[PDB]
């Protein structure tokens, strides 16, 4: 368990050093890839687009994203993985040998273990869902050429995300592969479970409560036993060079709370009374209606993302993050379409 992991870590460090030294004129592109792969874009830019066209795709997209993120946190907690930016400066493995230089970027101070890659998991799951849904829509309309093109695009996206994660020295190469495989598995599993559409608010509430209870109880039980699951928060602050790069939005509680909040918000929004009256005033099948809904949702959500909850106190930050992430599904399905109905169509 010792040598088998030390060899793998050394291989990862060597690969990161190679990528950083011999491909120096690509760093901005890799940063851009690592920025547009965050799940915030899957909850703010992709759900509004896919919900107004084949709503089932949007519902499946949100369910896959949320459950994949929760499984990612659980596996991160139970697997006890390292990261290749506090390892070279800490390990004793390089005694009697030169220390390979590694360059750190402002997007390379992550608080939390990285046994499965976080960006790769979500990207693989969401984009697999998107590609499969797009293929399923167009089957009725040289379809094999379309299959080839979309699968090539999806695999190119996955490979670019993997190289971006490795290049920044944020994760090891043996973690992005696991993330991609697990994301594909989760996407397939929720592809083959058609039992989440006709769901009442009670099921959504109970599911969110069960997930929250399991996470908190597991963490508290491990702490009571003696195991600390928040060891990485100490390491991230020390081995980060500039101390202003470590944030609080990339800690393994804000992500969980935001995922639970957006799940609860979607559940409340679907069962609301305003969603029932979508097909009133003006029929929802109109192409201009769908385009206007998409445009208004995107613009208002992008402007509303400018609000940042205060982080002086952690409990206030947590509650405000929950209440803020619970609104983004509630405003694109039940409020904006109602306003469009009441404004135009008469
Ligand atoms: O890909 P990494 O190294 O896990 O980065 C963390 C990512 O995973 C997450 O923890 C999501 O679970 C986010 O904080 C972030 O998007």
Residue numbers in the entry: 1 to 141, 147 to 351
According to the publication:
G6PC1 catalyzes the conversion of G6P to free glucose, which is then transported to various tissues through the bloodstream, supporting essential physiological functions.
Recent research suggests that G6PC1 may catalyze the conversion of fructose-6-phosphate to fructose. The cryo-EM map clearly shows the presence of F6P, confirming that it occupies the same binding pocket as G6P does.
